[PDB]
Ligand binder design. Sequence first.
Ligand code: HEM
Length: 153
Amino acid sequence: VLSEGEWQLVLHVWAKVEADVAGHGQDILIRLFKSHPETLEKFDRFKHLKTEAEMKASEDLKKHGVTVLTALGAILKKKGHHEAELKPLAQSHATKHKIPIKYLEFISEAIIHVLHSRHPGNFGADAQGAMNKALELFRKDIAAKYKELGYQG
Ligand code: HEM
């Protein structure tokens, strides 16, 4: 369970993200695909992209990144009260996309890398700790839902 103070560190950096969610989404997805190329293979729409340049130039990848970060933003703003938001996401990611928890750890890593790089003003050690706790909470709740749904994850 996060403290209010932890949630405020999370939402303070998220507010900066929201200055340009499309750019942040591109950086995060590209970092994920570069750091863990196996994750790209889950995306039938994107797995043809060969290079970072192709990824940066993809309008559809940018749109998807906005979709992803907007969903996660909505989850973070619930400050842990995210049961309703998690249900459809867990279902799609378990049953249609088949995303293991290990891959959710990888995208969590990518989020943290990007925030650390872009926002050292609002992502010092304490703030990163808070964001890690929020993402661990998300992953723990997603893992419990995967098990309910029948997916080992
Ligand atoms: C912060 C974690 C994540 C969030 C908030 C998120 C959010 C979303 C959202 C909102 C969608 C669109 C609706 C849906 O199908 O549920 C989506 C689609 C998808 N997600 Fe995720 N996602 C996350 C992590 C992952 C990861 C780690 C992978 C793969 C390694 C993944 C693979 C996919 C795929 C393959 C689709 C369908 C893409 C398409 O339209 O072609 N997601 N995700």
